[PDB]
Symmetry: C3
Subunit: 196 residues, 3 copies
Amino acid sequence: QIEDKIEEILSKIYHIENEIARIKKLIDSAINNVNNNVNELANNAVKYDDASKDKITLGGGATGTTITNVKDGTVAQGSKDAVNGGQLWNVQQQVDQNTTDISNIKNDINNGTVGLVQQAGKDAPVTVAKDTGGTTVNVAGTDGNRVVTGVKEGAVNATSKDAVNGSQMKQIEDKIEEILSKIYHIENEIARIKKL
Amino acid sequence: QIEDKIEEILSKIYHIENEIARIKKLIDSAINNVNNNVNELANNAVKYDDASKDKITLGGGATGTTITNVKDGTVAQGSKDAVNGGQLWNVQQQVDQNTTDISNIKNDINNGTVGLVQQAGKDAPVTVAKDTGGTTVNVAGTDGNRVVTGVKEGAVNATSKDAVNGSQMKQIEDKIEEILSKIYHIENEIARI
Amino acid sequence: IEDKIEEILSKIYHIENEIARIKKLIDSAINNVNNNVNELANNAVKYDDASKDKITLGGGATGTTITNVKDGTVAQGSKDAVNGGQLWNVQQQVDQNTTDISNIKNDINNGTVGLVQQAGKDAPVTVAKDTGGTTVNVAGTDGNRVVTGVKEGAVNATSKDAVNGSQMKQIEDKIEEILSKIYHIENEIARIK
Ligand SMILES: [Cl-]
């Protein structure tokens, strides 16, 4: 009738107050939820320093940040791929090898172990071109022929291959003169013998 | 006029209920929308491992992640800039160059084509200091003088610059001895006369 | 009763005000979280796609610098990024080797290393000076070798010089002269009565 309509009205209003009440709560936590998630992500995400994006300064503090699980970047001129310690490791091993081989070279040269002129120890004979052919050693240079000195007298026999020195030459030149002098007195005695 | 009053209220309530529903729908999609965006972002954002930020482990799984379009890092002492494939490439070209050079230095020492002592082929003469001057070759060791051996007989003529060996001097000495013999007897015969 | 209408109208009015207030605070809250999300979307580093197998930095053609990268473990198989300081260390060593290779070449040319040296373009050439032993052998796989380019050596009782074909020739030349003379002594001594 008339008081009927009014209770119906107060009834709906009551439900409305309750539904508003209820909905405030749901909306609140929904808002709070997404905010907490956004804040968590922001706290963890890696970022460009600014809108230009030409730099990322990592947030690990003065120690720095390790970045790991980096797939081997292409190693080529003009390549803009990050490289990892394993790729750097490979390079270092070849540089270490080079460093050693360089050292070995220097050592072998001084130890008389490589090259045409070698010596197997500090008391061994020095050999020259021992594993190679040819029949001539030539010691001439841009100023002409060279004297070969420090030569120890060589063996003097029928098949000796020792070089002979200035001293041994002298001994030969001494008997020659001796011969000639003795030919001189042989010739003067022949001359006096004739007079008589 | 009380009937009109009543259905002005009913109309008002009807509109409140339309509005509450309108609000439910709009907040519903507004919240979904912001949630989708965040989720999408959380799936694609690259992240630090924990709050220390001393480590990022890339999320590509066991075969890892390529990082690309990295600008050449400053290569200076204690630089903390990432370096790229191109920067490694430049260094690598130097190592190969050095490795090849090291291989070639050794090779030429063996073939005897560098240094003061050389041979331009397996039957070629052995040259000693051919491209420099001076007038002496000293073969004396810390133990004094040395015997030169393996010396093939040299040419004996008016202009020969060949080294002379022991066989050659043996032969001369024998002629000299033969002569000195003869002269002794020739001078001994002269004593009798 | 006309009084109840007043109370209803008053509640309605408060409910509408509450709706309005809820709209304001929701509009503000949604905008705020969207701003944070957009800010973050714009500035976060991202994987190219859902595989996460590549990150392409958003710097443009010029590229993006990554700095404050902690030194990566340099070890076989390591998947840590490496920095400029680490690359610089390797570069210093590579440089050292490039120099060392250069010196070696230079020093071989200048005759300053090894068993055969010459301290200057006009100095004596020395063979195995700081070393001992008493033999130099010049035989190769083709046997004994001739030593040529040998200038006349000193001829005296304590000389250590090598002798050449010319010198031997002057000796051989006196022999033939002697032999002829001993002939003209014997053809003459035989004439004795
Ligand atoms: Cl190197």
